[PDB]
Structure formats: C-alpha cells, structure tokens
Symmetry: C2
C-alpha cells in the first residue's frame, strides 16, 4: 500500500479507539493497515504466519539479544534462528 509495511505495522498496533467515528470505521482503518503491513498480495499464508510468529518472538527477546538482530532482515524464523545459532 502507501505506508511502508513497517510503518503500517506500528500504526496497526498503536491504533487508538474513538467512539466519535464508530466500530465500522475503526475496523475499516485497521483492515487497511493490516493489509499494508502483511501484504497478502505478495505473501503466501505461510509467509504471513511467519511474520506473526516473528512479531511475537521478537516481543519476548531480552534487549541485548534483540540488539544482535539490529539491521538484519526479519522475514524467516530459520534465518533469525541461525543468526543466533
């Protein structure tokens, strides 16, 4: 989409609800952001799940372990794992 996937990802997770726009508008906005992040037109189900798996995995890493991934691609668990044995 328009926002880069990394930016879409954060907009998606940091989304704040507002009654003034309503459930349907909020779901619509979340749905667009989720598409901009996970890009189903580009990725197989396998790859989409791998991106979710990585999000959860990185969220539980100690800061000093995470820092070892600084700059590295984050698309495949196999690659992340080998990046740390």
């Amino acid at each position: 989409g328009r926002p880069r996937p990394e930016v879409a990802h954060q907009l998606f997770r940091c989304f704040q609800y507002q009654e003034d726009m309503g459930p349907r508008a909020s779901l619509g906005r979340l749905r667009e952001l989720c598409n901009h992040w996970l890009r189903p037109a580009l990725h197989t189900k396998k790859q989409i799940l791998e991106l979710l798996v990585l999000e959860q995995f990185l969220s539980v890493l100690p800061p000093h372990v995470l820092s070892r991934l600084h700059g590295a691609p984050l698309r495949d668990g196999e690659e992340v794992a080998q990046l740390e044995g």
Copy 2:
C-alpha cells in the same frame, strides 16, 4: 490442531522466552501455536487477516463495549460492527 484455537491464541500471546531451550525451539513452538490458532488449512488469507484485525480491534474496546460482544461469534468484522451498529 490439538489445543482449541482460543487456547492456542492465548498460549501464543502469553509465551515466555527461555534461553535454556534457545531461539530455534522457541520459534518452533510459536509457529505450532500460531498454526493451531489461525488454522491456515481452514481459512483463506482474507479470513486470517480478519482474525488479526479483530484481535487488534477488541484490544482497544472499552470494557463495557466489549461486554456487548459477550457470547457472540468473532469471525467477521462486518458481523461485529453490525452487532453494534
């Protein structure tokens, strides 16, 4: 899979890292749980994304709004939205 999808979902989100098993074991466990939750064998990409959209949406609802969804199916944003206009 074996754990019900709702249970897998929580095991996935509540996963704690442990160095003693390592990155590869952790990613493997997360990958299984993510599959048990999102069931790509049963769901299209569209449906998998909708489940992620719903997870994010419900996470930002006020408790009293969420309670209005108590007992209701949570598979389609269209249905959740109409459940609240």
